[PDB]
Structure formats: C-alpha cells, structure tokens
Amino acid sequence: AKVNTLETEEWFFKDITRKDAERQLLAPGNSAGAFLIRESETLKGSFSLSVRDYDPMHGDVIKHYKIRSLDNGGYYISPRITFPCISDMIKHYQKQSDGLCRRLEKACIS
C-alpha cells in the first residue's frame, strides 16, 4: 500500500514535476550532490531520483534516474541491488555512488 507515503523525509518532493525539480535543485542554496525523490506526474507509486551534478563541460547539470518498483514490494535503480524502501535506497547511495553520477549528499532545500 502507500502508506509508503513517508513525506516525513526531507528529500521527498511528492507532486513536483521534472522541470520544477530541475529548477529547485539548480537554486543557489543547493550544491552539487543535492537530490530529491519525486513521484511520477501520472503514475502513483512510480518514482524518480533527481540529482544535481557538475560537469567540466556544462555547468551545474541535473540528472534523473527512474526508480522501479517490483510487484512483491521493494525498489531499485539498478537491478544489481534492490531495497525494501526508498529511504534505505537513499542511505545506500549517500554511502557510495554505485553507478550514479556521484554520491548523494544533501536533500534539496524546500
């Protein structure tokens, strides 16, 4: 169920769009490594990870990763490692980048 709506998390931006996520992440109060989780604009329980990066060729750049939900419960960005919830996934990728453009550092500022 959802239920899984843990909007108690500082990094969860439920009803924000892709573009607004990019705009909020690129704001001056945030830096490279900033991130958020957002729900799909159409599909409930479908989520994305949005991450602020810095590329030597472009400026600040925002990268998006689709999060997949398995029907039995659980989440993954890479099928190499699944998590029992989004919050464990965040902690994992805060610990090591493990395929992402960089380690997750701070939640995007409200």
Side-chain angles (χ1 to χ4, degrees), residues 1 3-13 15-18 20-70 73-110:
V3 180
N4 263 320
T5 52
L6 290 82
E7 274 158 329
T8 68
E9 310 277 10
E10 48 166 10
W11 40 254
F12 184 68
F13 288 59
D15 288 324
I16 197 169
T17 177
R18 184 187 185 96
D20 276 326
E22 287 179 3
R23 186 182 57 85
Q24 299 219 229
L25 285 164
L26 288 168
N30 298 290
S31 325
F35 73 95
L36 62 81
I37 292 291
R38 58 189 172 83
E39 192 182 39
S40 163
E41 302 178 36
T42 63
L43 277 54
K44 291 185 179 193
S46 188
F47 302 101
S48 288
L49 173 67
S50 290
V51 183
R52 175 167 164 181
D53 196 9
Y54 185 79
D55 181 286
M57 193 186 155
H58 313 279
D60 308 295
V61 289
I62 304 302
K63 303 186 184 166
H64 306 275
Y65 307 89
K66 187 177 180 176
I67 297 162
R68 286 184 170 74
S69 320
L70 66 94
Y75 300 88
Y76 68 88
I77 289 173
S78 172
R80 285 196 95 253
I81 180 173
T82 66
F83 306 86
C85 54
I86 301 301
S87 89
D88 286 323
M89 185 189 282
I90 294 303
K91 284 180 180 85
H92 175 85
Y93 285 108
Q94 277 176 320
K95 181 172 55 177
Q96 73 223 39
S97 60
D98 196 20
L100 304 186
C101 64
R102 67 192 302 135
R103 280 68 180 172
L104 301 185
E105 294 183 27
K106 303 180 179 52
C108 183
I109 265 30
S110 296

